Amino acid sequence: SMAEDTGVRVELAEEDHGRKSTIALRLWVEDPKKLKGKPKDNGAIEFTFDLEKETPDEVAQEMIESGFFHESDVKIVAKSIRDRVALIQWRRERIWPA
Predict the structure, then answer these.
(1) Neighbours of 84 (CB within 10 A)
(2) Rounded to a whole number, what is the largest CA-CA distance in the chain?
(3) Which residues cross the membrane?
């Protein structure tokens, strides 16, 4: 589905140089009214994401298993990661090459 403002932000922690399989990301809650479970506010959740081996759904599920979000918000977390990773991959394939 089209990218949207889900209430959950996912953004780069540093520039993507395109040379490695991993990128460094940060996730935080921008609008808690859009979540069924209201999390503790301990700041951004940092994480490295492997573009070759990992999916947005697996990382979202690991965040549920770690207690960061309510299980009824898993689809919102997964979509927020997916929207950001799709932009990173577009740039690697369609902009970054000479």
Answers:
(1) 21
(2) 45
(3) none
Alpha helices in the chain (DSSP H): 56-65, 74-94
* Alpha-carbon span 74 to 44, nearest angstrom: 17
Q: Which amino acid is at 21?
A: S
Mapped onto helix, strand or coil, the DSSP state of residue 60 is helix
Select 1-98's CATH number: 3.10.20.90, 3.40.190.150, 3.40.430.10, 1.10.600.10.
3.10.20.90
What's this structure's resolution in Å? 1.1
- Residue 7 makes CB contacts below 8 A (sequence gap 6+) with 29, 30, 31, 32, 33, 34, 35, 76
In sequence order, what are the residues at sequence separation of 6 or more whose Cβ sits closer than 8 angstroms to the Cβ of residue 75? Answer: none
CA angle 70/76/78 to nearest 5° reads 100
